[PDB]
């Protein structure tokens, strides 16, 4: 019988004898780069991962075949041109080599107005309105889809995206890069249902698809455009001196995007190590395999980590006597560059099978981007598991433990649309975690042709050691989640979250008071949820861990925690991200807070009936989660 | 009554298709630019001004390939440096 | 399920003129029959004194009715989500009535709505079969 200490020591022993850089270098060979989604080299890498999973002698290796619609470049070249409104001269600014997937194919001409990052606060604090004009923005703070959506909300006719040197210190000013502008995940032409032949692919378009053209441009093209623009960019933007704000009166910009849809076949590769007690419950570990360019940091690191973790855990089970109570699924996704399409469509295809069975997802994408900071974004249910992991895993460079800030949990940023763990948490209600060794700046070569192994090994000479540390974090996650009779999922964490919610409501108390409403029911629901969590912890303490039946009941009640925060009053097809804490849409608590914020601004932007329904539905979601956690239906106490 | 309907819709079709072939001088300039991936297309008022501006650009940028066409001038370059120089010259001269 | 596909037979030509096929419905029917047959076989081969194997099989039994609730519809605006016994455009009778409107050549037939109905019903049935078949890795779909 092996305990946690034995498993930790053997895991570290196997991590010492693992060569990650060799597999990273193999994934950057010419037979695998570039590996655009659905390409021949993508399938070659999929076959290699499948054969590696078979050679590790996992419990079962299989695959999933999807037919999804992506967007690629057309024979017609996208163009950014400058036209003189006198009509006397036209000037080709750039024929970009990159593009933005899911952009609408159109040609638009108008003024070019500079927005800092495309955020809503950037647009609000802008001198020149953007309605009817083209917007140029920097990348770095939000996804391309969020930028395009914010631009469309103000009736902009086009979006240009570039990488300034201050945010992206790249020597090559003519470097192209790639992205996508779909405000969502998965195949945007099968919104909410799997991209399988059984559906016979009916006509349906995701509401997150933009209706304006958006194109990526080089920094040289951005400076050429600034040459025809006026006005200094604000100092707090902290960008280059060549930055300008609005085009001159005599100059307009013509943007031509002609990207075309393309139906492709993508493969999702899977391997499973079955549990020894409860093999029907499982953790999922996934990594993106596709990439526009070489994708060493974007795809190679994660895929190498997946392969190494699968190999090491298979060796621990077959040779070291590791007996996990629950199963472990290793997944190589494709079409991740288009919005986690493979993972989202797998979730939509097997939601009925994953319901209350898959209890944790661990993402490995972009886990090694630097060495200064260790950043994590996860559901609160995993926070404790993260803390205990950070308190005994040492930094790859400094040698100290990763746990240096005791108030880290209050500074965690929630999962974003571009992260593969976001559809796991917000749509299917599975606790998800993403982590990375990174810098304060963004990795500059993501989505470019310079994301190669040379640049990665040059920026991170300790690449092997950092990859080992990331693999150790992931492996300790897996061991803690699968080795014992207890799940190590901390439901009590959500108490803290609820507190924050009502505190965020306090700044609008007066509004709540003049609409004839009260926050008393929310505080009563908080009390019920806190008491339910306390009763569950007491029952876990008083229970006998060898009594499988009592432990089974308590662990099922634990596994229903994340699911009960999915909004039961919204259509999962039109609003897939149903999680009231970490989803998107008018059913979430942040949406309630933004709608309530609009009441101070005394114009008609505040919607009172919508807010009343939001408050009612959020209150009963919280209260029903507390009631379900408290036990049987007849043991629920009502005032 | 139906004969008048077909007559009306035929005249409406002729109107729509006649409005759609309405080109500007800038449209032809953009077509010249996009056809050969030119850097600058300049529309002069006369062939003399076109020749003079083209010769000035050729003097400052010798490597440029100039196509003089009526009062249109098409500048094709091999590098972005020459494109920037030609654009500055044509826009400020 | 048999009755359902038989109710579809009277519209073969329609399904054929819209470029659609009923093959996926028959494949889902076969998958569901396979899941039910193996569940009965597992009940027969299991020992009733083993509390946990019986608990797992009984949980698979208790998920049968839930998996027929439409997972693509808002429970607030269309609470009767059951594709067999509910009301709304997500039910099989609504699909049949919409397909019925195509023979009776008025302009009441909505082709895009029918395609979405067919896709969502087909995958509801297929997902119920997959969930009843067992673990996610033991689904034989290709
Ligand atoms: C961005 O939005 C603004 C505001 O709608 C647009 O400017 C607006 O343009 C229209 C017509 O060009 C103006 O209508 C005129 O308004 C004057 C106001 O005194 C009125 O006296 C006239 O009878 C006529 O209705 C409108 O006022 C004007 N708004 C402002 C604030 O100037 C602008 O065109 C939009 N941008 C683009 C690129 O279209
Ligand atoms: C499942 O759906 C996919 C996607 O709709 C089907 O793949 C597609 O099948 C069509 C028709 O067989 C292929 O088009 C054909 O291409 C050939 C080669 O150029 C041409 O000779 C034909 O005239 C026709 O255009 C299409 O290429 C193919 N798409 C992909 C990405 O492979 C697939 O057949 C469906 N499977 C089943 C079992 O129904
Ligand atoms: C403020 O928010 C409320 C709530 O969302 C908005 O009221 C909503 O208005 C829409 C459209 O007027 C209604 O949609 C309806 O949907 C049913 C669904 O079956 C359909 O049958 C109707 O034909 C219509 O499309 C919706 O019922 C209604 N909701 C409520 C609670 O009243 C309101 O429009 C928003 N105000 C502003 C200024 O945006
Ligand atoms: C046929 O059915 C489709 C699908 O329900 C209807 O499309 C809807 O159109 C309305 C506006 O007309 C939109 O608000 C909805 O978003 C559409 N639904 C979908 C699923 O896209 C269409 O209106 C129907 N046609 C007729 C004539 O009733
Ligand atoms: Ca889908």
Numbering used by the authors:
A (entry chain A): 121 to 759
B (entry chain D): 1 to 93
C (entry chain B): 618 to 759
Publication text:
We developed a computational design approach for designing binding proteins with beta sheets geometrically poised to pair with exposed beta strands in target proteins of interest. We targeted the region surrounding an edge strand located in the hTfR apical domain. This domain is distant from the transferrin binding site (which is important to avoid competitive binding) and is exposed and therefore suitable for beta sheet extension.
As the conformation of hTfR observed in our crystal structure differs from those in other structures of the receptor, we investigated what our design protocol produced when targeted against this new conformation. In this new design round, we also loosened constraints of χ2 torsion angles of aromatic residues normally imposed during design calculations to allow for more strained but overall favorable π–π interactions present in the crystal structure. We proceeded with three designs for further biophysical characterization and found that they bound with affinities ranging from 400 to 700 nM. The docked complexes of 3DS18 and 2DS25 are similar on the backbone level, but apart from the side chains in the docked-strand edge strand, none of the interface residues are the same. The observation of strand shifting in the target structure highlights the importance of targeting regions which are relatively immobile; in the case of hTfR, a superposition of the available structures indicates high mobility at the edge strand, which we failed to take into account in the first design rounds.
